Write a protein that binds this ligand. Structure first.
Ligand code: EEM
Ligand code: SF4
Length: 340
């Protein structure tokens, strides 16, 4: 509030780049504990005698390295590609799908070689032109919540803004967006916020900004000319979810009244979890009310990795149909991009 790490690791090669040099100067000036690491994917000595201790301390650790995997992963249905600017998050959302993602790390990572990253992004744009290529920047992190430290997202926003056939988008649970308001986005960036019922936010989303904070930031970015959108996720069938989500869209409409919502977008994602979710989540959040009963769910099999549990077809349709009714009631002319 806003996030500042208690421990910072640096790859030695990171210091050769402008951002790495700038961060090293910043954190040494702040007197924060700094260590060295050979690879950002192999960080040693994070404090903690228990797994819970190491996990929580990792969430307060920043790692500064060089992106060496310049192949961009797909990020459908959100966008064509995931632009790799950062990985990990300081939040403690109980359901966070990044916890059980293959090769995920609990600590926060930022990449310094932005020239290489944007150059590769331009290559992908060139390969598909004159078709539009969309980039997701918050696929494996909360890029916005981290950005006050680096301004990497601001540079990405202004890079994409200068292109002809490139578009950027990202979604956040944080309100610390003041530095991005004067960015030359040029109408080519979709600034989104994750929203949910009061039940889900209060019980499952600690370490994030409040709903009022997210909406205050939503008004700022909209007022600064960004395309605005919302991601209703995870859509979770808690006790009283029907009324819970009704009141979400009602309150959302009240907090956005007066604004032009002609180009407003919605994305709907039902709660999913993997087979290793139960063991990991209960270890890290032992007092959680999160229901991970797999016998009530439908399993979707993985392609190259493992799959995940989602709600049964009839429950899923019921969620989709109900959410679509509320959006049409409170936001007519807003576009629902997908339900998954
Ligand atoms: C990984 Se989130 C990264 C972006 C940013 N840190 C943010 O939280 O908005 C991407 C979205 O997916 C949702 N989401 C997270 N976990 C799950 C899940 N297990 N099931 C279903 N949805 C899940 C989150 O609420 C986000 O709206
Ligand atoms: S804010 Fe997003 S990335 Fe961070 S823990 Fe919550 S769902 Fe995961």
């Amino acid at each position: 509030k806003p996030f500042v790490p208690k421990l910072v690791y640096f790859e030695p090669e990171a210091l050769s780049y402008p951002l790495g040099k700038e961060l090293y100067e910043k954190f040494t000036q702040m007197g924060i504990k700094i260590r060295e690491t050979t690879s950002h994917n192999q960080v040693r000595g994070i404090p903690g005698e228990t797994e819970l201790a190491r996990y929580r301390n990792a969430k307060s650790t920043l790692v500064v390295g060089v992106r060496r995997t310049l192949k961009f992963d797909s990020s459908k249905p959100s966008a064509e590609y995931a632009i790799p600017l950062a990985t990990g998050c300081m939040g403690h959302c109980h359901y966070c799908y990044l916890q059980t993602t293959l090769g995920s790390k609990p600590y926060i990572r930022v990449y310094v070689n932005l020239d290489d990253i944007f150059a590769q992004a331009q290559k992908y744009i060139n390969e598909r032109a004159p078709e539009i290529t969309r980039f997701e920047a918050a696929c494996t992190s909360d890029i916005v919540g981290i950005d006050h430290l680096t301004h990497s997202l601001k540079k990405a926003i202004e890079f994409i803004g200068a292109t002809d056939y490139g578009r950027l988008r990202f979604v956040t649970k944080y309100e610390h967006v003041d530095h991005l308001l004067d960015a030359r986005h040029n109408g080519k960036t979709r600034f989104r916020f994750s929203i949910n019922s009061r039940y889900v936010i209060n019980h499952f989303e600690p370490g994030t900004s409040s709903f009022d904070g997210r909406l205050a930031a939503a008004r700022k970015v909209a007022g600064a000319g960004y395309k605005l959108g919302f991601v209703v996720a995870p859509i979770y069938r808690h006790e009283g979810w029907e009324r819970g989500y009704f009141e979400l869209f009602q309150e959302l409409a009240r907090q956005l009244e007066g604004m032009d919502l002609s180009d407003l977008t919605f994305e709907l994602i039902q709660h999913r979890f993997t087979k290793p979710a139960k063991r990991v989540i209960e270890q890290r959040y032992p007092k959680t009310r999160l229901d991970l009963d797999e016998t009530k769910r439908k399993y979707k099999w993985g392609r190259y990795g493992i799959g995940k549990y989602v709600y049964r077809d009839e429950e899923a349709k019921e969620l989709e149909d109900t959410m679509r009714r509320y959006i049409e009631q409170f936001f007519p002319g807003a576009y629902v991009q997908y339900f998954t």
